[PDB]
Coordinates of C-alpha atoms in Angstrom, one line a residue:
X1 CA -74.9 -8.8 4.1
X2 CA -74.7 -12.2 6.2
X3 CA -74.0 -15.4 4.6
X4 CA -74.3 -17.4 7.5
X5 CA -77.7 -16.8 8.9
X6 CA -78.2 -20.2 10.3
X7 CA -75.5 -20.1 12.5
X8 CA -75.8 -16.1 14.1
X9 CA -79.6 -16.7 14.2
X10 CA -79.7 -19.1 16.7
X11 CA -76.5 -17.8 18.6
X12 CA -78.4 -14.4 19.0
X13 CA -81.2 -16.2 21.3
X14 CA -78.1 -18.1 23.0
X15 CA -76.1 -15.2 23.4
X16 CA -79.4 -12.9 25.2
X17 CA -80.2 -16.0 27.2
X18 CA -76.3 -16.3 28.9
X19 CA -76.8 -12.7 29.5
X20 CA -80.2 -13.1 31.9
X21 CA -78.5 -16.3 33.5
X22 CA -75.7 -14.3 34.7
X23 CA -72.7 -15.4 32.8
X24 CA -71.5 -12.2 30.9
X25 CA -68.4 -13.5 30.2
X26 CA -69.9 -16.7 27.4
X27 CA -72.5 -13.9 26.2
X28 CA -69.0 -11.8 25.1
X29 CA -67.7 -14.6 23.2
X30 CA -70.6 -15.2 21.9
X31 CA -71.4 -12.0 20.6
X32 CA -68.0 -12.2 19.2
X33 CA -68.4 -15.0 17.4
X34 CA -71.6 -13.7 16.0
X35 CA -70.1 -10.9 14.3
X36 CA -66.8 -12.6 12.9
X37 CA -69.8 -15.1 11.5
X38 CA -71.2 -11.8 9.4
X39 CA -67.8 -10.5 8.8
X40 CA -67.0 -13.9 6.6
X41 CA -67.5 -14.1 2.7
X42 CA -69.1 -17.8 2.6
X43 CA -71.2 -19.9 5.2
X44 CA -69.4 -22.2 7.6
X45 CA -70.3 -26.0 7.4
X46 CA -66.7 -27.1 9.2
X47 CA -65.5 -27.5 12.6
X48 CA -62.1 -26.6 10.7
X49 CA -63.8 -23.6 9.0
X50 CA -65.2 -22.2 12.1
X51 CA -62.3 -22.9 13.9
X52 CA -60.3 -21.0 11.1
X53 CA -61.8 -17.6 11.7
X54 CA -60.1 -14.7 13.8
X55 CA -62.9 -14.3 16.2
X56 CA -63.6 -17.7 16.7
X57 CA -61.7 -20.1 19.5
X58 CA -61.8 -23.7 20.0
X59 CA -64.4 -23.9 22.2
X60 CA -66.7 -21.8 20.5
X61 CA -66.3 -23.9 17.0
X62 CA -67.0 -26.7 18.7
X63 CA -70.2 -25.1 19.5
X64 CA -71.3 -23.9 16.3
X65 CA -71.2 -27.5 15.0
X66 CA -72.9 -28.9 17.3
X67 CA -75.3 -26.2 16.9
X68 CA -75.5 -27.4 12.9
X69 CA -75.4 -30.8 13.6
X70 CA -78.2 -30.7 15.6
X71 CA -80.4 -29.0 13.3
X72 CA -83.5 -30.6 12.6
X73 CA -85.9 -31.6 13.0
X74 CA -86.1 -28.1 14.5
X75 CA -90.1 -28.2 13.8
X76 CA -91.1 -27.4 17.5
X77 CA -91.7 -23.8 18.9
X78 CA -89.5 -21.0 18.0
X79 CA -85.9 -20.5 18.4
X80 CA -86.6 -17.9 21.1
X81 CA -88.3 -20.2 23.0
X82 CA -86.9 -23.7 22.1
X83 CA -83.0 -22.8 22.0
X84 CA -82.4 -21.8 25.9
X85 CA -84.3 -24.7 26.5
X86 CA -82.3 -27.1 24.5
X87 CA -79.1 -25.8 25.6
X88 CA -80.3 -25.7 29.3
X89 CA -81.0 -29.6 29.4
X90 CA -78.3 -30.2 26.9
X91 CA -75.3 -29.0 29.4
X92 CA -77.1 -31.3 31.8
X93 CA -74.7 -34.9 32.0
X94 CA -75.5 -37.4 30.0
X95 CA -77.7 -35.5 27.9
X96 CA -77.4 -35.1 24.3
X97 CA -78.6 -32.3 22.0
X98 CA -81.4 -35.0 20.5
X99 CA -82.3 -36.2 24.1
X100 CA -83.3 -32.7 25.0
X101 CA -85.6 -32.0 22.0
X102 CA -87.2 -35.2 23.5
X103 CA -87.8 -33.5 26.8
X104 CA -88.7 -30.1 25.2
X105 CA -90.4 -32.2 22.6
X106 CA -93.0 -34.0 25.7
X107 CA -93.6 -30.6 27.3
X108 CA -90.7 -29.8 29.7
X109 CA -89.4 -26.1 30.0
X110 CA -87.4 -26.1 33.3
X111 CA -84.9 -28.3 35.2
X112 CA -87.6 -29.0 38.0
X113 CA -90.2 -30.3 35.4
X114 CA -86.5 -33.2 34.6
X115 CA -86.2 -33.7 37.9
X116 CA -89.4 -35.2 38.7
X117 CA -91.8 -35.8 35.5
X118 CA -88.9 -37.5 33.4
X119 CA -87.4 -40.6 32.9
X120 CA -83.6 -40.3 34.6
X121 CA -80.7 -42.1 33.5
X122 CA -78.1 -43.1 36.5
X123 CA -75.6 -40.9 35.2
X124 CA -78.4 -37.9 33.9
X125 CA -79.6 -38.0 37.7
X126 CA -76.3 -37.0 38.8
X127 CA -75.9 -34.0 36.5
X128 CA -78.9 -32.5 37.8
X129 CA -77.6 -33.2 41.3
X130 CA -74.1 -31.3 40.5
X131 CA -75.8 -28.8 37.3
X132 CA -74.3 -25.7 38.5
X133 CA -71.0 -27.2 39.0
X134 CA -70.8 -28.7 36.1
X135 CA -71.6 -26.1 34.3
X136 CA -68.8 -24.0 35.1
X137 CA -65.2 -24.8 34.1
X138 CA -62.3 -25.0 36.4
X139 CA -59.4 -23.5 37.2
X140 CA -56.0 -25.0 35.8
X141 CA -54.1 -25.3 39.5
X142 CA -57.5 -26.9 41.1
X143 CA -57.3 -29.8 38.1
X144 CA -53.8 -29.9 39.1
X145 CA -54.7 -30.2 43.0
X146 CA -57.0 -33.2 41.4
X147 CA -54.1 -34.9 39.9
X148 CA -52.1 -34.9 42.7
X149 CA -54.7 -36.3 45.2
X150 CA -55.6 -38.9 42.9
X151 CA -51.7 -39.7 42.8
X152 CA -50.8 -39.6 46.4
X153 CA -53.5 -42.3 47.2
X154 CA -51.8 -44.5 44.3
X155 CA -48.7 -44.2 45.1
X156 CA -49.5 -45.2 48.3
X157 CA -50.5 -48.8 47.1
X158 CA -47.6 -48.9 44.6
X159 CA -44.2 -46.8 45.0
X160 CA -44.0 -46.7 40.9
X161 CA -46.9 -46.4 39.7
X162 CA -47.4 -43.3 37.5
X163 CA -50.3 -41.0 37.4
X164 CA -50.7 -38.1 34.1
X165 CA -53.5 -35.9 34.4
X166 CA -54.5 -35.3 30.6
X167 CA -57.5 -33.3 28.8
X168 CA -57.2 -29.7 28.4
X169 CA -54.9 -29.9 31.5
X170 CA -52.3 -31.2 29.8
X171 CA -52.4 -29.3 26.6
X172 CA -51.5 -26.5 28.9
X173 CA -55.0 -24.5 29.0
X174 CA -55.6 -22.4 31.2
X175 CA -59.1 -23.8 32.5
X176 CA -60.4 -27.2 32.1
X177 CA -64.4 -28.8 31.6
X178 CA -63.1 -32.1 33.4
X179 CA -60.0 -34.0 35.0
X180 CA -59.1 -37.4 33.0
X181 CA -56.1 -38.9 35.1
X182 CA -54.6 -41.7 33.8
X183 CA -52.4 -44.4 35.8
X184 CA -50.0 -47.1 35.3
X185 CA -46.6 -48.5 35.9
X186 CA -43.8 -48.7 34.1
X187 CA -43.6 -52.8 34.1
X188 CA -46.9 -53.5 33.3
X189 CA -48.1 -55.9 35.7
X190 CA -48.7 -53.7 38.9
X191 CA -51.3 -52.0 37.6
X192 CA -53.7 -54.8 37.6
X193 CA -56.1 -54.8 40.9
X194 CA -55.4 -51.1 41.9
X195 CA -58.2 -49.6 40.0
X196 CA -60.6 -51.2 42.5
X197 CA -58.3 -50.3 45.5
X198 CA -57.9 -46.6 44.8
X199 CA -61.3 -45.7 43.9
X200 CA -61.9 -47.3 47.6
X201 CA -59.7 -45.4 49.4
X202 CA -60.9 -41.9 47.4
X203 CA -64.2 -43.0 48.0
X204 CA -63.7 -43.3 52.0
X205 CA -61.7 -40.2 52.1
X206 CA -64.4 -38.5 51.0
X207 CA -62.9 -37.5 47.7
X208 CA -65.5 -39.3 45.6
X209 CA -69.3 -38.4 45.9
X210 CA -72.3 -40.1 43.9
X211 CA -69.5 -42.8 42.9
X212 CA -70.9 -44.6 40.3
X213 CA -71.3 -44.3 37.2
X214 CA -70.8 -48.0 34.6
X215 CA -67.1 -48.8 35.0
X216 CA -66.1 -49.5 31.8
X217 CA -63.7 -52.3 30.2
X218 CA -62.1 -51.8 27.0
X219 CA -59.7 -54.9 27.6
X220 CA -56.6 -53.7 29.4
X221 CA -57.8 -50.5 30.0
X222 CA -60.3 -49.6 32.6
X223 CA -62.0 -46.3 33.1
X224 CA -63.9 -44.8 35.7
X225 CA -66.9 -42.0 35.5
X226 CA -67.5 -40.3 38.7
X227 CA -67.4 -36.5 40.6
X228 CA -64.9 -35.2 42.8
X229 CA -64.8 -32.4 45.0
X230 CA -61.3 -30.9 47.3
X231 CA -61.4 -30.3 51.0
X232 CA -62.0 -27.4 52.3
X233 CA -64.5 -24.6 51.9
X234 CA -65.3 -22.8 48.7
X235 CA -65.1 -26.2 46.8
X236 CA -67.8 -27.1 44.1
X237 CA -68.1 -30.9 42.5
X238 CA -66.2 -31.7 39.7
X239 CA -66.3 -34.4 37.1
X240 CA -63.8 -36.8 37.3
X241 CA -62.6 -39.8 34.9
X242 CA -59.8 -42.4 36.0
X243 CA -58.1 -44.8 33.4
X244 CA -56.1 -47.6 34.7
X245 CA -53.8 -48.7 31.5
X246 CA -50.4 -51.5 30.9
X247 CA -47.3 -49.4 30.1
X248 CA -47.7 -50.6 26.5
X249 CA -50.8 -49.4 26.0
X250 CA -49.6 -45.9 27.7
X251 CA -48.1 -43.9 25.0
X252 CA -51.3 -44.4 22.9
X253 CA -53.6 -44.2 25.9
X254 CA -51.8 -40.5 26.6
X255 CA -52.2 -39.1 23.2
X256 CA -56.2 -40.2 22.8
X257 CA -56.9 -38.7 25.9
X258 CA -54.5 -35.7 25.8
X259 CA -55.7 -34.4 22.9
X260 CA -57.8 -32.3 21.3
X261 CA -60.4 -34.4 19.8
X262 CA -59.7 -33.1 16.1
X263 CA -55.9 -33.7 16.6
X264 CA -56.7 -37.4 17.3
X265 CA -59.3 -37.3 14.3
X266 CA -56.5 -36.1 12.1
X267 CA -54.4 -38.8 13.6
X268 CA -56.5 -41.4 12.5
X269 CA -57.1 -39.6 9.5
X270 CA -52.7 -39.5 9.0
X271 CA -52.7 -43.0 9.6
X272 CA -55.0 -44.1 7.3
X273 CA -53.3 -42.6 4.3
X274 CA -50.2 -44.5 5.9
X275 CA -51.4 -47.6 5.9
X276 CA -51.8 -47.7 9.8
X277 CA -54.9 -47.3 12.4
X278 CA -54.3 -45.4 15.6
X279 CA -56.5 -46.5 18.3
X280 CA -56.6 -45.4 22.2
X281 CA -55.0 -48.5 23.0
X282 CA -52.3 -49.0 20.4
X283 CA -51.2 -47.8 16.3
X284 CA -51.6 -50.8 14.2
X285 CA -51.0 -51.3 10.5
X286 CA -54.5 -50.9 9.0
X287 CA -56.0 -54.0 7.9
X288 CA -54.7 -55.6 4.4
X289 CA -57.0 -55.4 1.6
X290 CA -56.4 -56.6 -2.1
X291 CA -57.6 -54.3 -5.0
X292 CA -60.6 -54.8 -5.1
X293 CA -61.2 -54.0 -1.5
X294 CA -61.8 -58.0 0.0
X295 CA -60.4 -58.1 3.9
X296 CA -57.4 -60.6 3.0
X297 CA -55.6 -60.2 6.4
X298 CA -55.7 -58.7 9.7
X299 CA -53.6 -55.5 10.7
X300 CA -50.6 -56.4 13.2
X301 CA -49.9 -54.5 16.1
X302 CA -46.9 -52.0 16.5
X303 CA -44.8 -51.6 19.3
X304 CA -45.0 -47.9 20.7
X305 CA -43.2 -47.5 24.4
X306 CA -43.0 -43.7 24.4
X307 CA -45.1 -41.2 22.8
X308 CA -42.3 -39.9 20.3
X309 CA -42.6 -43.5 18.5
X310 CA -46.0 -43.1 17.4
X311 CA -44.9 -40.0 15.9
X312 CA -41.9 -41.3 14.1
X313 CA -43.4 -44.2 13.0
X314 CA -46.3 -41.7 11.3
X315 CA -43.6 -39.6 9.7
X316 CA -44.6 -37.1 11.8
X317 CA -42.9 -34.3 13.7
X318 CA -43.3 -34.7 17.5
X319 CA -45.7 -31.9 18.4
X320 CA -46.0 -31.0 22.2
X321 CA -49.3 -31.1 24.1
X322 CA -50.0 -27.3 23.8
X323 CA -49.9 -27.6 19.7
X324 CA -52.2 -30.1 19.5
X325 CA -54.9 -28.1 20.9
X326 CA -55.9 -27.2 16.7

């Protein structure tokens, strides 16, 4: 018999509606997935737990969670009807599983009934713009021809500045959702200005294509949102994020956005129990709290150059990029 019933039930309509849109090779996995689910003596409620199962990948736990966190309210339609609907406005950027219940939830069914009778966000009008290339994931050695063009135009402002393409890229997977290159140099000052500069000189080139998207500031670090797309025929639009960081804040700017997202959550969690908080933009010592659980001082700062030292100072093993993938 099958314990886990709400997971298989809704990835049966998921894994028939891949099949119509064309993409055989998601239906497979998840018609993999759907039978390690009945092969398993209790019901998953984990990423961990999902993630701990033979026919299950990364990817595809990821999935199933968001599939269960989603959950209700679940009240409208069917789960025939409702789920390829959900997950078609879902993949859409800047959408969220709970946005697209709203948009099934006024009426909407297709992509064309978004693009005109609803309300579009900046950055949810440029997914619809670039859905089908979005949607797709990209080869390893294209996010690597990314990198390199991002780096060659910064390089050419500054001889030492240093650009790290990170993500699933740098984890050492062989295909990647997105490109997240980060820059900066090595004495912490020439950094400053060129964020502006290079996203310029990409944008001129041609390189850059529905540009903006909020640029963010998270103090030293700034971060841009945007899609890219190669010269040359055959190429499709890709998303792009570049993060413009001080050498200090490097090592801990590299491991946040290297990865994976439950290493880093782990991270935190290791730190905790050590006293410690590890943020993107540095590991500080958690902040000081008597007995009874009163704030009584604020958590210093700790000085981490390389990304061994944030290890070491977590009494952890240095683990290299492809085994943090978990």
């Amino acid at each position: 018999t099958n314990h886990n019933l709400h997971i298989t039930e809704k990835l049966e309509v998921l894994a028939k509606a891949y099949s119509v849109q064309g993409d055989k090779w998601r239906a497979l996995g998840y018609a993999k997935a759907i039978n390690a689910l009945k092969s398993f003596h209790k019901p998953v409620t984990s990423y961990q737990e999902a993630c701990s199962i033979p026919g299950i990948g990364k990817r595809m736990a990821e999935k199933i969670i968001e599939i269960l966190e989603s959950g209700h309210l679940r009240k409208l339609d069917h789960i025939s009807e409702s789920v390829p609907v959900l997950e078609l406005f879902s993949n859409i950027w800047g959408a969220g599983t709970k946005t697209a219940q709203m948009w099934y939830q006024q009426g909407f069914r297709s992509l064309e009934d978004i693009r005109s009778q609803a309300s579009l966000t900046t950055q949810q009008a440029i997914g619809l713009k670039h859905y089908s290339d979005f949607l797709e994931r990209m080869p390893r050695e294209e996010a690597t021809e990314i990198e390199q063009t991002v780096q060659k135009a910064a390089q050419a402002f500054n001889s030492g500045l240093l650009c790290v393409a990170c993500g699933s890229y740098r984890r050492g997977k062989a295909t990647c959702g997105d490109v997240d290159v980060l820059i900066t140099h090595p004495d912490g000052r020439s950094h400053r200005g060129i964020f502006s500069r290079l996203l310029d000189s990409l944008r001129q080139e041609g390189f850059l294509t529905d540009d903006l998207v909020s640029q963010e500031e998270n103090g030293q670090q700034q971060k841009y949102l945007g899609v890219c797309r190669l010269p040359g025929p055959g190429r499709r639009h890709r998303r792009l994020d570049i993060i413009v960081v001080p050498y200090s804040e490097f090592a801990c700017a590299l491991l946040y956005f290297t990865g994976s997202a439950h290493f880093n959550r782990s991270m935190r969690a290791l730190a905790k129990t050590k006293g410690m908080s590890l943020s993107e933009h540095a590991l500080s010592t958690a902040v000081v709290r008597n007995t009874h659980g009163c704030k009584v001082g604020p958590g210093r700062v700790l000085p981490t150059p390389t990304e061994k030292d944030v290890f070491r100072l977590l009494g952890l093993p240095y683990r290299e990029p492809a085994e943090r993938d978990w």
